[PDB]
């Protein structure tokens, strides 16, 4: 069956360079067109570029956006296109993704994140929203690099609970929120915990909440 | 900037391919190929099993022989050997419906179940799933108490597999004659097309059982006197009655191959018409049976001369047989090409004519010399029949041995005929199976393990019974193959058993063990009960020369010992693989700083490599250092967080020893209690019957030992502190500060202390309880009939030796619990072998073993099928 099997990425500090590979299979790679396509988190799909097939020159175009900077290539013999990123920036953190054709994107690799970012590993710091229905929660604070799981009441409680996708603030560290809505009988021998979790800083903290 | 030229060549390469997957899918609605992936057959001529009816017909002998007795009946016939055993047991069936149940439905019910067995689906999967059943079959009089209407109606021949089996696909009942087991195969392949089903059963099935049909076709004169069918030959004199189960499983080829099953053949294409305005309304029409023949060749694709063989109706007729033969000689015999003559026979020449059941029974035929590249022989008595024009040469009987040999497509193929007396008529053309082409712990072993499954153990040993003179017959079949078979393409029932061999010799050799009561070294058996697993992590006594140094390549194993090595190399100066590989000045195993540390770090990655392998424990229990153990795999503590409780608590115990002493007493409580009166106290009591006594005083234990002399039996515990006594009171303040930063966390698994006699919510484990874990008695007796009388069915100790499975017998014993008792390693073994042989014994008792993990995939192969227990039902109304 036709394959996109995208790989590559990862974390990378700014100015420093990064070569993602697209490794096509069950189809005539050579025939197609090859283009690139990100999408910075949150927000829309932004072309980057594509390159012909060599039937139509092997020749390729690019974005504004990283003209001079990224170069595409494709390798025929191996069926596998390249997105070769140089003196990268932390505005080009996105998914990537590798599709087949330059005007009819007809096939999609699963993508593949980019984060470019100087901030070193660091823990989070739990600060609770104590239950001013009822309404507690945990804030995790000022990690790098993602992710970081929350539960509560170690997954005993899941009724009422909303995590909220991580944010990432201007210190280059990412904050987030998890919340639960109780029955206002905070303290009827109902404790409320929340187990964060952030596994890249060996990192396991308990939290009580209350008032 | 893309000029429109490549912008147009984009989306006509796109209409283009759209066009193809178009005109496939037209295909696939059309012809795609069914795959014939499991069957089964209980046809005349002692033929249980497929591989039977291949014996019977390879060693040219019928099955011609005089009525039996067992029915209600100058006289021969064809019949089966347990027409009339049921095992109403294994349906849910009261004996009061079973005896009122015509054969043909149980027969239909049983045999359904081997072809299940035969494809490798373990029956319960199919339950609430989309399959459908398909059952050629004739109203023969077999009632002529209660259940009778259900037991007699067609409809319920069909129905009542998918109830029994709780399928939800379509479920019919066929009646086209001699040709009805066709036409419920080709019907099955229009269902599977459609998408009314996923799989299905399709076969048919007959017993004679009335008084009419035997004398009825005598007074007709279409019989033989022999009861022999003669197929071909001058000597046709009719057919031979005779009777059957055929069956087959089918799939859509697309589906099988997804799913990795094994494909005997595929249906490449069948057709089903009728004879139409015919000399009569029992008269063939040699050129219907043309036009069926085409009109199969066009639903495949091919054309005659790629068919090698024909499976015949022959039915042994004087002039039946040449009007197939002309209706053959115009279709097959004619642009043969030079692939050579067509091979003809009929496999009723060696068990006449099953009825509804002929064709799937001709089908089963020509699938077993698919599997061997060899032409599937037919009696063939006498002479070739002087009414039948032979002269081309390119029509033979397939007399003897003969290669099966493909056609252009490399593909070798065989057309089976079935044509009913009410004229309606089938052909389907059979063609070998395509091409089929395409991680695990516990990882190299050499020997393999044999799970064995049945409803009652007679049924169990008879299972062992017959795959051990299987594996006898047919020795080179891969053992990996045995294995992976008996594990993951079989039901698992209650009664179980396990055999662990390297070889096929060794495999029978135990497997037969089985058969028989016996006790031998790689056999072991129990009965599988729900309740869970309880992982138990023992005290002191476990330790051997480098115990589990066999395991320490399991990666998962390794793995878990690298994190205890970085963990003990920080706190205590030295690690677990030096002591446990071999130890070139490590630390000695007789010092109680290093044993009780390397333990722990081998009970929790044995732990680890028990649920990597499908264990879950449903709760823990631990005794003494062990209870550490137990609070890492229950996650109410961390590793690193465990391997330093274990390594400053025993160092703790270390700065304490000397002037202590430790003693087993093979005695009750109270009664050593009571004696403990003057004469110092009890640490522990494991078991009804034994007490270890502590005290030290050395002194002291020197003489109880003494007294014990008298009668009880008492020995001294290679040690030299005094722990569970206030002995290890100064140690109190320097190791609750030490272990001041342990974190407990809620435990995932339930948590069961022998300290506090009740199950614990986890974090109560902070460096105070791990004192009062080293001072107080532990109260191991109490815990484990607590564990019980919750319903608690398997004690597994996790430990490189047992110490603590004896006491925990006793004390089921005394609570006459059925609970079992498992080890993982022993002294003499710690290799993957043995844990291997734990795993197959925990197997027996209920747990789920991911037989898959452990192992990796093998191939199925066609071992037999469940042993039914059939008692007798025969109603003589």
């Known amino acids: 069956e036709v394959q996109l099997v995208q790989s590559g990425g990862g974390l990378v500090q700014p100015g420093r360079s990064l070569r993602l590979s697209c490794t096509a299979s069950?189809?005539?790679?050579?025939?197609?067109?090859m283009s690139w396509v990100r999408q910075a988190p949150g927000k829309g799909l932004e072309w980057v570029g594509f390159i012909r097939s060599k039937a139509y020159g092997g020749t390729t175009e690019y974005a504004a956006s990283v003209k001079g900077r990224f170069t595409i290539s494709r390798d025929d013999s191996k069926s596998i296109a390249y997105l070769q990123m140089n003196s990268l920036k932390t505005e080009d953190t996105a998914v990537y993704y590798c599709?087949?054709?330059?005007?009819?994107?007809?096939?999609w690799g699963q993508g593949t994140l980019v984060t470019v970012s100087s901030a070193s590993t660091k823990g989070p710091s739990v600060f609770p929203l104590a239950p001013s229905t009822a309404a507690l929660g945990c804030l995790v604070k000022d990690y790098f690099p993602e992710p970081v799981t929350v539960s509560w009441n170690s997954g005993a409680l899941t009724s009422g609970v909303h995590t909220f996708p991580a944010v990432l603030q201007s210190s280059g560290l990412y904050s987030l929120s998890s919340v639960v809505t109780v029955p206002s009988s905070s303290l009827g021998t109902q404790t409320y915990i929340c187990n964060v979790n952030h596994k890249p800083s060996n990192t396991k903290v308990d939290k009580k909440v209350e008032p | 900037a893309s000029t429109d030229s490549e912008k147009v060549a984009e989306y006509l390469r796109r209409a283009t391919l759209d066009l193809r997957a178009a005109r496939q899918r037209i295909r696939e609605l059309e012809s795609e190929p069914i795959a014939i992936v499991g069957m089964a057959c209980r046809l005349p001529g002692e033929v249980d099993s497929p591989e039977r009816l291949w014996e019977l017909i390879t060693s040219g002998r019928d099955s011609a022989a005089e009525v039996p007795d067992d029915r209600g009946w100058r006289a021969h016939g064809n019949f089966m050997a347990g027409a009339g055993d049921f095992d109403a047991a294994f349906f849910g069936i009261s004996p009061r419906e079973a005896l009122a149940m015509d054969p043909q439905q149980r027969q239909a019910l049983e045999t359904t179940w081997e072809a299940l067995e035969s494809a490798g689906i373990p029956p319960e999967t199919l339950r609430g799933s989309d399959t459908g059943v398909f059952v050629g079959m004739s109203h023969q009089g077999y009632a002529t108490d209660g259940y009778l209407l259900t037991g007699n109606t067609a409809s319920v021949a069909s129905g009542r597999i998918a109830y029994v089996l709780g399928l939800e696909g379509p479920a019919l009942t066929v009646d086209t004659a001699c040709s009805s087991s066709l036409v419920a195969l080709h019907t099955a392949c229009g269902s599977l097309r459609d998408g009314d089903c996923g799989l299905a059963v399709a076969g048919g099935v007959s017993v004679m059982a009335g008084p009419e049909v035997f004398t009825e076709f005598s007074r007709q004169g279409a019989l033989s006197p022999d009861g022999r069918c003669k197929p071909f030959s001058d000597e046709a004199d009719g057919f031979g009655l005779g009777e059957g189960s055929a069956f087959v499983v089918l799939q859509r080829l697309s589906d099988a191959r997804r799913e990795g099953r094994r494909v005997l053949g595929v249906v490449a294409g069948s057709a089903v018409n009728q004879d139409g305005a015919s000399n009569g309304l029992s008269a063939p029409s040699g050129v219907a049976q043309q036009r069926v023949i085409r009109r199969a060749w066009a639903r495949a694709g091919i054309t005659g001369a790629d068919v090698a063989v024909v499976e015949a109706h022959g039915t042994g007729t004087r002039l039946g047989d040449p009007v197939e033969a002309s209706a053959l000689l115009a279709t097959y015999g004619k642009s043969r090409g030079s692939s050579g003559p067509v091979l003809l026979g009929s496999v009723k020449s060696n068990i006449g004519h099953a009825q509804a059941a002929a064709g799937v029974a001709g089908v089963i035929k020509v699938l077993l010399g698919l599997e061997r590249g060899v032409v599937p022989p037919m009696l063939c008595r006498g002479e070739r029949s002087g009414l039948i024009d032979w002269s081309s040469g390119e029509i033979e009987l397939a007399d003897g041995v003969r290669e099966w040999s493909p056609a252009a497509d490399g593909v070798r193929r065989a057309g089976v005929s079935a044509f009913g007396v009410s004229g309606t008529n089938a052909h389907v053309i059979i063609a070998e199976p395509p091409e089929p082409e395409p991680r695990r712990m516990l990882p190299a072993t050499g020997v393999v393990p044999v799970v064995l499954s049945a409803r009652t153990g007679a049924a169990l040993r008879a299972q062992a019974g017959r795959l051990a003179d299987h594996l006898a017959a047919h020795p080179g079949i891969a053992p990996a193959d045995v294995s992976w078979t008996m594990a993951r393409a079989r039901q698992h029932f209650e009664e179980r058993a396990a055999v662990l061999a390297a070889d096929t010799a060794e495999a029978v050799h135990r497997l037969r063990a089985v058969a028989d009561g016996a006790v031998v070294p790689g056999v072991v058996t129990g009965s599988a009960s729900d309740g869970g697993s309880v992982f138990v992590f023992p005290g002191q006594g476990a330790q051997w020369e480098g115990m589990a140094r066999e395991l320490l390549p399991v990666p998962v194993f390794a793995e878990s010992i690298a994190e205890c090595d970085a963990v003990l190399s920080e706190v205590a100066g030295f690690s677990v693989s030096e002591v446990l590989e071999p130890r070139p000045d490590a630390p000695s195993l007789e010092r109680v700083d290093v044993v009780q540390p390397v333990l722990f770090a081998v009970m929790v990655s044995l732990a680890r490599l028990w649920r990597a392998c499908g264990a879950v424990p449903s709760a823990v229990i631990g005794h003494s250092q062990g209870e550490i153990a137990a609070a890492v795999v229950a996650g109410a503590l961390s590793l690193e967080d465990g391997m330093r409780v274990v390594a400053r608590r025993s160092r703790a115990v270390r700065a304490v020893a000397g002037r202590g002493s430790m003693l087993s007493v093979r005695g009750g409580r109270s009664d050593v209690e009571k004696l403990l009166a003057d004469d110092l106290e009890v640490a522990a009591v494991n078991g009804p019957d034994a007490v270890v006594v502590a005290g030290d005083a050395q002194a002291a234990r020197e003489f109880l030992e003494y007294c014990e002399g008298v009668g009880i039996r008492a020995r001294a515990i290679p040690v030299d502190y005094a722990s569970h006594t206030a002995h290890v009171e100064p140690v109190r303040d320097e190791l609750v500060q030490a272990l001041a930063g342990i974190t407990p966390r809620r435990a995932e698994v339930p948590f069961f202390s022998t300290l506090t006699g009740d199950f614990l919510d986890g974090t109560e484990l902070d460096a105070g309880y791990w004192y009062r874990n080293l001072r107080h008695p532990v109260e191991f007796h109490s815990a484990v009939q607590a564990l019980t009388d919750q319903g608690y069915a398997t004690f597994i100790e996790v430990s490189p030796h047992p110490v603590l499975a004896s006491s925990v017998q006793e004390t089921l014993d005394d609570a006459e619990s059925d609970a079992a008792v498992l080890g993982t390693l022993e002294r003499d073994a710690g290799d993957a072998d043995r844990f291997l042989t734990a795993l197959a014994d925990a197997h027996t008792r209920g747990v789920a073993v991911d037989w898959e993990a452990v192992l990796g995939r093998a191939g199925l192969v066609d071992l037999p099928g469940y042993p039914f227990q059939g008692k007798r039902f025969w109603l003589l109304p």
């Open positions: 599709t087949r054709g330059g005007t009819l994107f007809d096939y």
């Open positions: 069950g189809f005539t790679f050579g025939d197609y067109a």
